[PDB]
Amino acid sequence: SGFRKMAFPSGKVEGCMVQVTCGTTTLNGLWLDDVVYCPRHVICTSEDMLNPNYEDLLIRKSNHNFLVQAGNVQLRVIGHSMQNCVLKLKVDTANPKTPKYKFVRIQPGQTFSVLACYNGSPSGVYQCAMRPNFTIKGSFLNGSCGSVGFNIDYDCVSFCYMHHMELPTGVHAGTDLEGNFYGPFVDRQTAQAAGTDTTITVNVLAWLYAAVINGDRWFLNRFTTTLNDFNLVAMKYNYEPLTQDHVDILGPLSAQTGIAVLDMCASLKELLQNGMNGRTILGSALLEDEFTPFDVVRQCS
Numbered sequence: 001s002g003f004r005k006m007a008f009p010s011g012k013v014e015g016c017m018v019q020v021t022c023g024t025t026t027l028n029g030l031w032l033d034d035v036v037y038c039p040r041h042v043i044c045t046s047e048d049m050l051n052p053n054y055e056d057l058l059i060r061k062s063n064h065n066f067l068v069q070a071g072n073v074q075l076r077v078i079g080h081s082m083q084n085c086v087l088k089l090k091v092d093t094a095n096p097k098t099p100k101y102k103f104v105r106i107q108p109g110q111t112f113s114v115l116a117c118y119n120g121s122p123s124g125v126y127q128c129a130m131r132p133n134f135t136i137k138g139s140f141l142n143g144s145c146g147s148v149g150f151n152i153d154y155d156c157v158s159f160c161y162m163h164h165m166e167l168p169t170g171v172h173a174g175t176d177l178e179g180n181f182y183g184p185f186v187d188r189q190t191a192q193a194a195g196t197d198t199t200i201t202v203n204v205l206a207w208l209y210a211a212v213i214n215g216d217r218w219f220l221n222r223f224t225t226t227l228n229d230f231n232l233v234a235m236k237y238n239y240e241p242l243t244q245d246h247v248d249i250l251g252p253l254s255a256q257t258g259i260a261v262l263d264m265c266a267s268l269k270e271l272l273q274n275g276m277n278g279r280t281i282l283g284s285a286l287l288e289d290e291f292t293p294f295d296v297v298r299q300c301s
């Protein structure tokens, strides 16, 4: 029993983290086979952040200008190119610790683990969700850029996020490993605006199922609802609409608990309309939306 915000084991990603220094800027790089991937703003300075010309900045850099270190060992850069907002540094040594991996672009509402790194060395691992407005609520300081987000399926690491920036909000934005930003953001210090965030309804429901599986059942009421009637209430509380696809995705949890999805929807409707009255669910006094249905099943095997 028990339910915790649980991250993937990070060992396969730890063996890929290197440090990239160009001038006075140092961030993290991802070393896979003979390529190091890192955010392109490693080539910027203070002169170069309102509106950097990255192609201009890059042409003035040699291979030798890129100092790449894997732990105590310098990796010689033999080629460099830019792909969207990431740099690809070809090095002369393939990483012997390269795991089986893929590059994936994740969807809003999906979750992943972040390995927070500074100077190429891991500091901590935590689980994050891609918010509907394409931000993440992470924990990143100066020098954390190039830290990656990932999921593991069996022996395969799916890299899906590389960290680039913090919005003045306190939320974070980055790219996939092809260097394309999630959301309408750009890697420059300009007035950009994150859209309004919403609550990921299918995730809240999955977490209510996790509560039931763990014996926290006080919120189950005797009612049912239609999907249309539920969504009218969800809309009022800034919850995402629940689709039939989401309903099907909750099938395994519904079967395990014997609670129909639309019956759980009726219980969530009452929690939204009435509050929790000082009670908790799985030790939380708020409804949690950063557990996907897959996350719940995986944890509650």
Ligand SMILES: *C(=O)[C@H](C[C@@H]1CCCNC1=O)NC(=O)[C@H](CC(C)C)NC(=O)[C@@H](NC(=O)c1ccco1)C(C)C
Residues within 6 Å of the ligand: 027, 041, 044, 049, 140, 141, 142, 143, 144, 145, 146, 164, 165, 166, 167, 168, 172, 186, 187, 188, 189, 190, 191, 192
């Ligand atoms: C990379 O290591 C840093 C990590 C940031 C900065 C430190 C605090 N947390 C964090 O995640 N990334 C940067 O410094 C970027 C550099 C790019 C060339 C933009 N700059 C920012 O993240 C900057 N954000 C903005 O200027 C901005 C305006 C609108 C939206 O974002 C921060 C420092 C305010």
